[PDB]
Amino acid sequence: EAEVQIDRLITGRLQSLQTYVTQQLIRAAEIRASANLAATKMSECVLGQS
């Protein structure tokens, strides 16, 4: 019975880890887009005139 119990535990924990990883990937992509915008804004609105 221990194999069955630990199998249930493992599958549940793996699903939770999958969810966390996917959320982290989405947030990282959005932050990367925002930082690209910030880099362009800093490069063009400081070292020159807009």
Binding site: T40, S43, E44, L47, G48, S50
Partner: peptide, 8 residues
């Protein structure tokens, strides 16, 4: 005209 967009 925008600076440092393409090229340096």
């Amino acid at each position: 005209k925008r600076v440092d967009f393409c090229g340096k």
